[PDB]
Design an enzyme around this catalytic site. Sequence first.
Site, PDB file in Angstrom:
ATOM      1  N   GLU A 204       4.376   1.845   1.692  1.00  0.00           N
ATOM      2  CA  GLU A 204       4.915   0.578   1.486  1.00  0.00           C
ATOM      3  C   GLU A 204       6.020  -0.134   1.959  1.00  0.00           C
ATOM      4  OE1 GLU A 204       7.504   4.385  -0.090  1.00  0.00           O
ATOM      5  OE2 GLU A 204       7.510   2.760  -1.631  1.00  0.00           O
TER       6      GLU A 204
ATOM      7  N   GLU B 184       0.772  -1.057  -0.281  1.00  0.00           N
ATOM      8  CA  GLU B 184       0.142   0.122  -0.083  1.00  0.00           C
ATOM      9  C   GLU B 184       0.911   1.361  -0.047  1.00  0.00           C
ATOM     10  OE1 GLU B 184       1.850  -0.617   2.863  1.00  0.00           O
ATOM     11  OE2 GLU B 184       0.502   1.413   3.124  1.00  0.00           O
TER      12      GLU B 184
END
Length: 1019
Positions: free
Chosen positions: A429, A426
């Site tokens: 990271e 997401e």
Amino acid sequence: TAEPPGSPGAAATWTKGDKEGVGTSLNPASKVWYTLTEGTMSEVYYPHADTPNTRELQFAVSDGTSAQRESEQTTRTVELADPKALSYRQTTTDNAGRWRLTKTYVTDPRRSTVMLGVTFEVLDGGDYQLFVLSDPSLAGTSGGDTGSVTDGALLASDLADAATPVATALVSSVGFGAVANGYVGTSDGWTDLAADGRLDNASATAGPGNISQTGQIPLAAGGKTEFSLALGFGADTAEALATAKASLGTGYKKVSKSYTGEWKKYLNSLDAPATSLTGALRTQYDVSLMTVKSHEDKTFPGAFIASLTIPWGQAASAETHREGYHAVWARDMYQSVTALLAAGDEEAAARGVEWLFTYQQQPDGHFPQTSRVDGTIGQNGIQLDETAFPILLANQIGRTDAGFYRNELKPAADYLVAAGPKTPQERWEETGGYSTSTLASQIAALAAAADIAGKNGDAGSAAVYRATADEWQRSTEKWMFTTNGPVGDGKYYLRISATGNPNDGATRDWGNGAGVHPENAVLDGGFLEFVRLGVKAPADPYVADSLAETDASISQETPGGRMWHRYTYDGYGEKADGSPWDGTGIGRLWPLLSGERGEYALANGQDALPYLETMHSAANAGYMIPEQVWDRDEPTSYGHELGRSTGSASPLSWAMAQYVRLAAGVKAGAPVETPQNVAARYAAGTPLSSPELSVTAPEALSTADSATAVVRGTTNAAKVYVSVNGTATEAPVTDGTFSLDVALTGAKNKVTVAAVAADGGTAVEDRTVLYYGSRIGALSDPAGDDNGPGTYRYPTNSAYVPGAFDLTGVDVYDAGDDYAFVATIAGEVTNPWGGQAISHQRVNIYLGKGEGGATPGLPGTNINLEHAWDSVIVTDGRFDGAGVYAPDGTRTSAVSLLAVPEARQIVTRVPKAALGGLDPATARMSVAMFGNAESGEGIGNVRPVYDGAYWEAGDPAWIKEWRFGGGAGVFDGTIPSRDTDTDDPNALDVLVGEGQTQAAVLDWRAGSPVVVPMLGLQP
Ligand SMILES: [Ca+2]
Ligand SMILES: [Ca+2]
Ligand SMILES: [Ca+2]
Ligand SMILES: [Ca+2]
Ligand SMILES: [Ca+2]
Ligand SMILES: [Ca+2]
């Protein structure tokens, strides 16, 4: 050549991430970006926004006995020198008020030179010496630098990298009085001056290694002296020198005006900001705007690096090439161009979209996690929002021409469809699964792509994109909105779910020392992206119940206003003692999140001005908005204040962009980047119908019998489209039914069926079809048959997973130049012992024409076949024992093994010629499953079966743990069979025909060796 002492020079680090100010010319001819920290000039990037070359440049003043650095004078200030230009002024005053230094930064817009306008004032009786201290870290490395002298200038280079060679030239408008090159930590200027207040070193050369240069500035008679420095950059020493000289030739004042003028014009040409912006909020707007623009590369227009900084840089070694934050992230760029778009800079966006798809986009369609300004891939994590944002950027800009659609946009959109709703990483990271934040961008990107495809006459791809987007949009709550969370009312969007069941309470490690916590317990404001991207109405109730718990879990009130942490337990920030992050710590407040909340408030008709006030309360005197601000009442040893920069990283182009974009939204009365065509579909008034769609064939996962597969079912929609791996074809709907023989185009075919109602509503259905060629014929076999005559047992060791030796089927396909013999087992296809595709299975397939009678199988087999055979296909991935053999053990051909775990299949590619004329279409065959084994474990690489009681007894231990039991015989190391009884077959299961049973055929008690039936493939 004689060298000053100290080689190779001390280990070095980068600089404090919190920059007092940054700057670059608007003109792309000047490939120079400067940053400031601690009262000095820190990293200066060149020739790309992704390459730092400096560490520190400051002044030292001596009385002839003692010497000082301005970085140690407790009293020094920073202030932007022009409210409409990125020019800063640092002021240093002696702790004993004996002297004062004033430095103003600017760059030559026409060439790569950073210029300094300096004024030195002696407030004493006088008698002071002034020296510039320049410690470079050329080409992103503190080592490998060489300093020299020529024509009164201080040169330095690092041409180790042929790609990006770097060299500098430091020149004084009044020349230098004394110069010296040296090794940091031993012969550098400060080490020398500190000692006796005298510059003893006079070496005109130093390095390669970690060196530095120092030059004495001749002072003027009287109280003060005015002069300027020009630090020029070039591919070589000659160029750097020439360039720096040209700048001094034009002069500071002139260059300064020119630099300031360009910015003044840029700002004044862009959209006028909201009149309701107070003085400070306007200056913040202006500086944040220029800063975002300054993050755009000059060599690759359209490319934006995340930030001209290195987080916690004082603790980041500089010996090796590092990425820091000075690289290109599709996400942050999105934030940057979307902000510039809000201000009126259309050109930057057009270049941006072009650069993204031309340079960073990978051939498969998706965008890399990170890249260099030239597109060279950096980090390779898969973040679906980084492929979605560039699409949304193209949607906002109108970049929808047929060519760009086919070769650029479509591959990106197809990737999202193929990738599914779960993202491996997401926006922070770190983890994967159903992310509210990322799925929001996935949905909006796909919905925009559908309109873009429809505009281009590609109705098939449009339906697939819209159907998919719609399906994910209507699943947002089912997948990520928990109803049993351990916070407040228990109802709110969680950050991310692995399974898509927000109430399962599944746990995971959240890194940075946060440890394990149920997903139910991690809150994250990323759900606000739903209304921000038009995926949900501004007043969406689900998004609304999330506020309370989310605010309670990760938000707090700072003196400047409410701020939020990224997510619960986040540990990406300073440690409890105030110490920098080093792998673990505790995440702090991120001001950009206030701006995000501001857009949500704005979208709901509320006054977003206070959020702008909060974001600006986090800025320093230079208006640089940091990534993080302290969140505790107490100030660790490291003076930290609640709501002020932790000092780790500032500015963040993203946070700077969020300020501009929200401010633009305030003037518009609504968030200005929200995709209008998306919002018109999901956030507007009337709902669309949800057509009924049923795909009766094929099933979720199947294997085609040819190059086409039947896709059929029912629907009450007007139109139906069937798309295979990006290629869509319409299926005429008749009486609510459809049926299309779609063409397969790969080994694995992702099939997507989209139904479209008369009003535009959709329904979608996914199917996976494996293709091997035209099916010649097939053989079937029941499951739970893996026990020989019905009394054998797998070796106890865990490696032998249940059903591993249980055949459920055998399908043969004509695959061009090869025959695809596909075996299917009930168990999972595992390969731990590191073999070719498999480790434990050794299936035999005896091919013949049904001639003669009883015929022995391969050696260690202990079985006979119904009739003779011309060759056998041995599927064994261990010891290179796979291939086709003749009855005499000779291998007549090599074979290829491929494991397809999803289908619990084992594919053996057999070159047609391997079967000397024997056509599998009309051949008879016997199929038996054996356990592979080493030669010294049994002849023929077959794991033998021993007596039941004997095996159960477990003695020795390896018999019951690594051998089969339930047969006959005990171990014997003298003979090649290692079995004292080979009358019982070693096959765990075989295939039989009508009227027969595996129990009878494998009953060695009734006759030995057993006779496995020779059967034929059924079309
Ligand atoms: Ca270097
Ligand atoms: Ca150095
Ligand atoms: Ca491309
Ligand atoms: Ca079976
Ligand atoms: Ca035996
Ligand atoms: Ca069987």
